Amino acid sequence: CEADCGYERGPDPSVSLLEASTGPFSVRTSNVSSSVRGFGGGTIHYPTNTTGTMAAIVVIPGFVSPESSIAWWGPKLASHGFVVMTIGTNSGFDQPASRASQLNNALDYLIEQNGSSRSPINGMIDTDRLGVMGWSMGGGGTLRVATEGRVSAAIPLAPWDSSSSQFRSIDTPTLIFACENDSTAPVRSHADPFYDAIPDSTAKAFVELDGGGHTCANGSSGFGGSYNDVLSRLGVSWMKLHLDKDQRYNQFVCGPNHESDRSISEYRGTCPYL
């Protein structure tokens, strides 16, 4: 459904809530062995004190990178009312197109586990409200999955891919995080043309972060992590807005002056959405 569908959860939000180190819920974890079919294992994060179903999200890493490179997003998102699996790839050599098939395989796995007597998330997932996230080549895999129209939200992080024309099929709400000093996936050859290739009719957002390099959109529990608040405020809201059709989180994506944030170097968007 697109409006007043009854997927909303938690309080009416504010900025202090969004930028807290955790959402209103408590986080647990369930291991996925690397023997899992379709990807190289992961960790499932879930709230403990909620009711009702919730959207599923999968987060994939980039080239020769372990799941831990993006695993900050697992707890940060689960604590706001999501089921969130951070995954590892079959091989660190996997290129965008493989990383997209593994996105879909890990979404398929999550759907299977929602029906598994042995899963801590059995009956906790609405298997129609799915989101994807990815760093670098996994950010290209995210954009590729955003062309299929199964997922209702995509957040690429420092995306890397090779062809940009394929993204004119993207009708899925996509928020691309970019890093201004990205030498690995240069903005001007990657994030920038991927955003531009998305139709203006699609709800989309380009949030370039100020001064940061290739890992600036991954979050961090210690070293780095000056971007945690833009990531938390805009990422959680984007997922709350488009996975939970929760208009109460519209005010943080459409309405503010984003470049006024010291951490935001360039914002582009298509506000208003619907």
Numbering used by the authors: 17 to 290
Mind quoting what the paper says about this structure?
The main structural difference between Ple628 and Ple629 was the presence of an extended loop in Ple629, which is longer than the one present in Ple628, with the four extra residues S264, G265, F266, and G267. Interestingly, Ple629 is structurally more similar to the marine PETase PE-H than to Ple628. The root-mean-square deviation (RMSD) of atomic positions of Ple628, Ple629, and previously characterized PETases and other hydrolases confirmed that Ple629 is more similar to mesophilic PETases such as PE-H and IsPETase than it is to LC-cutinase and Est119. In this study, Ple629 had higher catalytic activity than Ple628 both on polymeric and oligomeric substrates. However, the calculated turnover rate was higher for Ple629 (284.5 min−1) than for Ple628 (269.9 min−1). Surprisingly, Ple629 released high amounts of T after PET-NP degradation, reaching a maximum of 736.3 ± 12.0 µM after 72 h of incubation. Reactions supplied with more than 1,000 µM of additional BT released less than 50% of the BT formed by subtracting the amount of supplementary BT. This observation indicates that Ple629 is inhibited by this degradation product. The activity was comparable to the activity of an engineered high-thermal stability variant of IsPETase, namely DuraPETase, and its variants incubated at 60°C, which indicates that Ple629 has enhanced degradation capabilities towards PET-NP.
In this study, we recombinantly expressed, purified and characterized Ple628 and Ple629 as marine PET hydrolases. As predicted from the sequence homology to the lipase and cutinase families, Ple628 and Ple629 both belong to the α/β hydrolase superfamily, and the central twisted β-sheet is formed by nine mixed β-strands (β1–β9) and surrounded by eight α-helices. Like previously described for IsPETase and PE-H, Ple628 and Ple629 form two disulfide bridges, DS1(C217-C254/C222-C259) and DS2(C288-C305/C297-C314) (positions in Ple628/Ple629, respectively).
